[PDB]
Design a protein around this ligand. Structure first.
Ligand SMILES: CCCCCCCC/C=C\CCCCCCCC(=O)O[C@H](COC(=O)CCCCCCCCCCCCCCC)COP(=O)(O)OC[C@@H](O)CO
Ligand SMILES: CS(=O)(=O)c1cncc(N2C(=O)N(Cc3c(F)cc(F)cc3F)c3ncccc3S2(=O)=O)c1
Ligand SMILES: CCCCCCCCS[C@@H]1O[C@H](CO)[C@@H](O)[C@H](O)[C@H]1O
Ligand SMILES: CCCCCCCCS[C@@H]1O[C@H](CO)[C@@H](O)[C@H](O)[C@H]1O
Ligand SMILES: CCCCCCCCS[C@@H]1O[C@H](CO)[C@@H](O)[C@H](O)[C@H]1O
Ligand SMILES: CCCCCCCCS[C@@H]1O[C@H](CO)[C@@H](O)[C@H](O)[C@H]1O
Length: 293
């Protein structure tokens, strides 16, 4: 009686429960991120008081988040289910490339917000910041991101069921590449950002009341980004630099860890508009307007 209910759980009840939760979490994030991030862009298009430097950059974060949610999220959901590539050789280069480009645009956008706030508050009359110069920064963020993520597209290969993965001729190249990737897309920008906002914090809490309502929001966006991107960033360093997760002792535990980590990246795109709702009264107003209409 008891042994049967253990194999019923193992062989049927747990796998379906797992697959249900996995698809439900991905679909919920997909819809919430698409609706939320479109309402961010519309809010600065409809409202003209909201067209500040920070908000022009926050719209660029949403464009990057939509790129990842529309194209990369479904490819990720199907790979996390089947553990195989079903989109052919071309999209095995394009989709991982667009994921990388999306991450680069996101972390560079947040960096330039911190840099703008750091000079706006801590060093006030050194550099001038306007919406016109913000659009030129935004285009430069895309140009850099599209270029620096070409080696990523270059190593992606689809090999025969098919599997999409990075192809490396030697053991040292993936170690150097993934070390640079982690430092450049995660550790150095967020460490510098942390130090910038700590100084902004000391200035505003050591025009002001408005700057405090927006700095507060900004620090939460950077903290949630750091948290959402930490599991996958660490897991890829452990795998590519420290040669971990090669033993099939618990093939499924490794899949579960990487699966949840992949979902968390996409969960961040759903999180940002929810943050602007509870920490920005101006955004909340145009969010209440969208649900009322
Ligand atoms: C502030 C600092 C951060 C920002 C720095 C800003 C600097 C911006 C500068 C220049 C922009 C222009 C770069 C444009 C990218 C250059 C284009 C490029 O990457 O060429 C590729 C080379 O592929 C390859 O083997 C690439 C394999 C990867 C080799 C890894 C070596 C480690 C070097 C460490 C790299 C850093 C990584 C950090 C990235 C975030 C593809 O070629 P190709 O189709 O002919 O071959 C295909 C062949 O591989 C298939 O057999
Ligand atoms: C869209 S996908 O599901 O088709 C797909 C298939 N295979 C691979 C990927 N990549 C991906 O998931 N990671 C894992 C990863 C992130 F996202 C984000 C990070 F901040 C750190 C990471 F460690 C990559 N990591 C390093 C370099 C390139 C990639 S990547 O090529 O962008 C995507
Ligand atoms: C003779 C060998 C043919 C093997 C077929 C490979 C199966 C991959 S189907 C894949 O589906 C995508 C849907 O997004 C399309 O965009 C792609 O073009 C297509 O490749
Ligand atoms: C890799 C680290 C990021 C590099 C940081 C450099 C800052 C770019 S400033 C930005 O550059 C645009 C280029 O198009 C100009 O048009 C804009 O006027 C200007 O504001
Ligand atoms: C079917 C097409 C097969 C192409 C395979 C693409 C793999 C990228 S080769 C890449 O070349 C670099 C030279 O710069 C070395 O540093 C790296 O060690 C090596 O990984
Ligand atoms: C964050 C690092 C602090 C821990 C100290 C160890 C530094 C060595 S790096 C790493 O050690 C691996 C061991 O498995 C090797 O296989 C890799 O070739 C090498 O790149």
């Amino acid at each position: 009686e008891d042994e049967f209910l253990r194999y019923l759980w193992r062989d049927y009840l747990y796998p379906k429960q797992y697959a249900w939760v996995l698809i439900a979490a991905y679909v919920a994030v997909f819809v919430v991120a698409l609706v939320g991030n479109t309402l961010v862009c519309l809010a600065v298009w409809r409202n003209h008081h909201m067209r500040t430097v920070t908000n022009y950059f926050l719209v660029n974060l949403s464009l990057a988040d939509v790129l990842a949610t529309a194209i990369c999220l479904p490819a990720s959901l199907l790979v996390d289910i089947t553990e195989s590539w079903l989109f052919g050789h071309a999209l095995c280069k394009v989709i991982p490339y667009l994921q990388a480009v999306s991450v680069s645009v996101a972390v560079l956008t947040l960096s330039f917000i911190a840099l703008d706030r750091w000079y706006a508050i801590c060093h006030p009359l050194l550099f001038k910041s306007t919406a016109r110069r913000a659009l030129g920064s935004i285009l430069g963020i895309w140009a850099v991101s599209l270029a620096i993520m070409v080696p990523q597209a270059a190593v992606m290969e689809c090999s025969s069921f098919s599997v999409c993965d990075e192809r490396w001729a030697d053991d040292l190249a993936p170690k150097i590449y993934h070390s640079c990737f982690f430092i450049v897309t995660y550790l150095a920008p967020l460490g510098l950002m942390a130090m910038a906002y700590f100084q902004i914090f000391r200035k505003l809490w050591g025009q002001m009341r408005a700057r405090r309502k927006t700095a507060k929001m900004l620090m939460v966006v950077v903290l949630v980004f750091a948290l959402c991107y930490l599991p996958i960033s660490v897991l890829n360093v452990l795998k590519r630099v420290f040669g971990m997760f090669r033993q099939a002792s618990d093939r499924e535990a490794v899949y579960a860890a990487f699966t949840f980590s992949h979902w968390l990246v996409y969960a961040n795109s759903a999180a940002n508009p929810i943050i602007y709702n509870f920490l920005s009264g101006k955004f909340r107003e145009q969010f209440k307007a969208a649900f009322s209409w």
